[PDB]
């Protein structure tokens, strides 16, 4: 965490800094998108 890294989340490619988030995803909710229709939040597949 806390560094610009390449990540593969459930087959989803990405590149960015992973930081702790204050969003409370619903139990079913998996991916988060911002106003500009881009992936901004993710839920770790192992630790909720």
């Amino acid at each position: 965490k806390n560094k610009c890294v390449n990540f593969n989340f459930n087959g989803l490619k990405g590149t960015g800094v992973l930081t702790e988030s204050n969003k409370k995803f619903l139990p079913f909710q998996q991916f988060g998108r911002d106003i500009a229709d881009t992936t901004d939040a993710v839920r770790d597949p192992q630790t909720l």
């Binding site: 911002d34 106003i35 500009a36 881009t38």
Partner: peptide, 23 residues
């Protein structure tokens, strides 16, 4: 008072003259 950002490439350059100088 009466008049009322993701950057995947777009940016908003600040104006050269601030509001104080215009005032």
């Amino acid at each position: 008072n009466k008049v009322t950002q993701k950057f995947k490439g777009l940016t908003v350059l600040p104006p050269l003259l601030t509001d104080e100088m215009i005032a």
